């Protein structure tokens, strides 16, 4: 891991954590990710999660 200087390594770890976290945040605000598992039966509005 010598090629990239130790600065970018920690920058990248923190960036990955931040990007994953903001993706999680936007997942809640998302309109359509709520995808009612097994929509073969629309019987009940079981609005459930992903991401």
């Amino acid at each position: 891991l010598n090629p990239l200087s130790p600065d970018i390594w920690m920058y990248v770890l923190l960036a990955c954590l931040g990007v994953s976290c903001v993706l999680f945040v936007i997942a809640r605000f998302s309109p359509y990710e709520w995808y009612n598992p097994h929509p073969c039966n629309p019987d009940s509005d079981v609005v459930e999660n992903n991401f």
Binding site: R28, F29, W34, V47, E48, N49
Partner: peptide, 9 residues
């Protein structure tokens, strides 16, 4: 209602 529904879950 939208924020509560998508927040508490």
């Amino acid at each position: 209602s939208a924020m509560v529904e998508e927040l508490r879950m």
